[PDB]
Structure 1
Amino acid sequence: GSFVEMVDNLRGKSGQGYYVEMTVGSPPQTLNILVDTGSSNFAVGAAPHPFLHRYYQRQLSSTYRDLRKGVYVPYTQGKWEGELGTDLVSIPHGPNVTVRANIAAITESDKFFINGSNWEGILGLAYAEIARPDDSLEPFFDSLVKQTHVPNLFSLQLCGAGFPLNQSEVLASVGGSMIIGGIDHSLYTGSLWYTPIRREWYYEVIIVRVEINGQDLKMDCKEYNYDKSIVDSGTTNLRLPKKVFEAAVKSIKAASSTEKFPDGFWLGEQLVCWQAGTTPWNIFPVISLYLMGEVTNQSFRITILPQQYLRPVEDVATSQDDCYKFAISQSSTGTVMGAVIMEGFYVVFDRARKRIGFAVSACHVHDEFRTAAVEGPFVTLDMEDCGYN
């Protein structure tokens, strides 16, 4: 019910990532690590880089083991090379356990580390199927569960501030909670609703309906999950398949049409600013994603506000204006429920029961008139048909 040792153990923000403190090696080396539900490698900076203030020094760890194998990891935007090994790993604000885990020691990288992000490595929390270089490299959470009595479950509360944080404020500020092995009831309101994990690779789910201000987007539900839909704390935006993105943007523009925004805003590139305190939240629609439920022919919905999908940013000029970027963008690799949508919800990664739970976050940003919601049930037929093959 209560996991006080782990509450408030995250820092960061949607634009640069949420991270947890970890230690690696003997004696322990402290590093800040991105929480990434959309990948499956534990990978840490292990050599000097301009954007790293510290890195893993394998030669100073008595418990370091060399696996004598390189890994080359190219992403769409960014890449790194590293060397595989194992070492003892702990999470200080975590379960009181130490485990031996695989670590990819990053020795070279391009456009991977983010200037000012305050993290030095990534904790891939998804499944072995998508680990690099192959599925034989046991992910961290798998090791944790196998080596300890920690329950096979974790839960994430990512806390968006609702305003920009300077790098001073972002260091001093609590960014949320990763509860390892449990569900903390203080982090949510109302009921938890669960959707099945379709397959254990990414945290893949099935979206069965989409509404903008209650209006059905009315696409074939396969389009919403083309070629998959995942829950991904290591992606900033809500990302939608091209066709869904075009339909959603058209509907959001129509709902918000009392104000005209430039193409660059809708493309997620350009900020828009309002006089301090005057952001017209009410002109922007709510977005509801309906997810397959655990009961046959049953769905539920999660509803987010513009306070979720408009990401606060600092003005390019010097001002007291309230400024934002549109944090919904197109994808060619399926739907990605990124950090901006996770900030609305307490999300339970129930690996043991192959399901993901959603509840309204106790730290979601809202106004006096509307809140994020998790509601059900709804009768929905032929939901397995919504899955892309």
Structure 2
Amino acid sequence: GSFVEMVDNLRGKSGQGYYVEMTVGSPPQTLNILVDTGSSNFAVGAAPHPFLHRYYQRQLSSTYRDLRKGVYVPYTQGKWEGELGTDLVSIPHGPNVTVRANIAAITESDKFFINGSNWEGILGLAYAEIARPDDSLEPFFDSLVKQTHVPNLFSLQLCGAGFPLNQSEVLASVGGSMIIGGIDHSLYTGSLWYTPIRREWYYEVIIVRVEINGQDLKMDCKEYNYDKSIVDSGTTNLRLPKKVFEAAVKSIKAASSTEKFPDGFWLGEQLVCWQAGTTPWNIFPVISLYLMGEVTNQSFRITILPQQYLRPVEDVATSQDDCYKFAISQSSTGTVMGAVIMEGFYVVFDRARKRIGFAVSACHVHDEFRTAAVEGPFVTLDMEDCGYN
């Protein structure tokens, strides 16, 4: 019911990622690790890097075991080269257990570490199927559950501030909670609705309908999941398949037409600013994503506000204006429900029952007139046809 020891154990923000503290080796080497539900490798910087002020020093760990094998891991954003091995790992603000897990010691990288993010590694929480080099390299969460009694489930509450957080602020602020092995009821309001995990590789789900301010985008639902739809804390934006993205932007533009913005804004590249406190939230539409339910021909929906899809950023002039970037972008690899979307909800990755739960987050940003929502049920047919093959 409650896991006080794990509540508020996350820090960070949508644009730089959310991270949890972990320790590797003996004696314990503390490192901040990016929580990534969109990959399956546990890797840490293991050599000096301009953006790192600390890294994993294998020669100083008595429990380090060298697997005598290198691995090359590229992501959409960047990539790293690492040396595989194992060591004892713990989560200070997590379950009171120690696990021997696989660790990729990063020796070379390109556009992977983020300057000023405060994290030095990544925690891939997805399934073995997409682990590199292959599925024989057991993911951290799998080792955790196998070696301990911790229930096969974790939940994430990512908290966007709603405004820019400067360097010192983001280091001192609570970014959210990662409850390992349970669900903490204080992190959400209303009811939890579950959508099935279609297949166990990414946390894959199926979107069956999309609305912009109640208006049906009206596309073949297969387009929404081409070539897949995933829940990914390791990606900032809500990324949509090319065809869906173009349709969504046209609709969002139509709904917010009382004000015109440069193309660069809609490309998610340039920011838009308004005098302090005057952001016209009301001219932007809410976005509803209907997800397949656990009951036959039943679906539910999660609704996102512009407070979620417009990401706060500090103005180039550090002025007092409230500025933002459009956090919805085009994808060529399916739908990616990133951090800005997760920030509106408490998300339960129920691996044990092969499902993902959504509930209104106790820390989501909104205004006096609208709120994010998770509602159901709705009658929906042939939802399995929405999945891509």
TM-score by length of 2: 1.00
> Deviations 1:301-357 (Å, cap 9, x if unpaired)?
000000000000000123100000000000000000000000000000000000000
State the shift of 1:115 in Å: 0.1
- Give the percent of matched residue pairs that are identical in Structure 1 and Structure 2: 100
Partners of 2:82 and 2:93 lie apart in 1 by: 27
Partners of 1:75 and 1:348 lie apart in 2 by: 25
Secondary structure of 1:330's match?
Answer: strand
State the shift of 1:77 in Å: 2.9
1:123-162 aligned at under 5 Å gives the runs 123-162=123-162
State the shift of 1:197 in Å: 0.1
Partners of 2:264 and 2:354 lie apart in 1 by: 40
Secondary structure of 1:301's match?
Answer: strand
Secondary structure of 1:253's match?
Answer: helix
State the shift of 1:26 in Å: 0.3
Partners of 1:77 and 1:148 lie apart in 2 by: 33
State the shift of 1:83 in Å: 0.3
1:311 corresponds to which residue? 311
State the shift of 1:144 in Å: 0.1
> Deviations 1:107-143 (Å, cap 9, x if unpaired)?
0111100000000000000000000000000000000
State the shift of 1:53 in Å: 0.7
Partners of 1:94 and 1:78 lie apart in 2 by: 29
Partners of 1:362 and 1:168 lie apart in 2 by: 24
Tell whether 2:380 aligns with 1:383: no
Partners of 1:78 and 1:361 lie apart in 2 by: 30
State the shift of 1:369 in Å: 0.3
Partners of 1:84 and 1:100 lie apart in 2 by: 13
| Structure 1 stretches lacking a partner, 5+ long | none
Partners of 1:136 and 1:348 lie apart in 2 by: 26
1:34 corresponds to which residue? 34
Partners of 2:269 and 2:93 lie apart in 1 by: 36
1:205-284 aligned at under 5 Å gives the runs 205-284=205-284
> Deviations 1:29-62 (Å, cap 9, x if unpaired)?
0000000000000000000000001000000000
Secondary structure of 2:340's match?
Answer: helix
> Deviations 1:181-230 (Å, cap 9, x if unpaired)?
00000000000000000000000000000000000000000000000000
Partners of 1:135 and 1:305 lie apart in 2 by: 38
State the shift of 1:100 in Å: 0.3
Partners of 2:60 and 2:75 lie apart in 1 by: 30
State the shift of 1:243 in Å: 0.2
Partners of 1:136 and 1:259 lie apart in 2 by: 53
Secondary structure of 2:288's match?
Answer: strand
Partners of 1:297 and 1:370 lie apart in 2 by: 29
Partners of 2:88 and 2:219 lie apart in 1 by: 49
Secondary structure of 2:7's match?
Answer: coil
State the shift of 1:78 in Å: 1.5
Which runs of 4 or more aligned residues in structure 1 lie more than 4 Å from their structure 2 counterparts after TM superposition?
none
> Deviations 1:13-38 (Å, cap 9, x if unpaired)?
00000000000000000000000000
Partners of 2:14 and 2:163 lie apart in 1 by: 11
> Deviations 1:242-272 (Å, cap 9, x if unpaired)?
0000000000000000000000000000000
Partners of 1:50 and 1:223 lie apart in 2 by: 41
Secondary structure of 1:244's match?
Answer: helix
State the shift of 1:76 in Å: 2.8
Secondary structure of 1:357's match?
Answer: strand
> Deviations 1:72-109 (Å, cap 9, x if unpaired)?
11223311100000000000000000000000000011
Partners of 1:245 and 1:185 lie apart in 2 by: 34
State the shift of 1:289 in Å: 0.0
> Deviations 1:341-377 (Å, cap 9, x if unpaired)?
0000000000000000000000000000000000000
Partners of 2:253 and 2:228 lie apart in 1 by: 26
Partners of 2:253 and 2:54 lie apart in 1 by: 45
Question: What RMSD over aligned residues (CA atoms) do the two structures have, in Å?
Answer: 0.4
> Deviations 1:137-159 (Å, cap 9, x if unpaired)?
00000000000000000000000
Partners of 2:170 and 2:286 lie apart in 1 by: 28
State the shift of 1:388 in Å: 0.2
State the shift of 1:237 in Å: 0.1
Secondary structure of 1:352's match?
Answer: coil
Partners of 2:181 and 2:189 lie apart in 1 by: 20
TM-score by length of 1: 1.00
Secondary structure of 1:377's match?
Answer: strand
Partners of 2:6 and 2:308 lie apart in 1 by: 24
1:181 corresponds to which residue? 181
1:113 corresponds to which residue? 113
| Structure 2 stretches lacking a partner, 5+ long | none
Partners of 1:15 and 1:246 lie apart in 2 by: 23
Secondary structure of 1:353's match?
Answer: coil
1:170 corresponds to which residue? 170
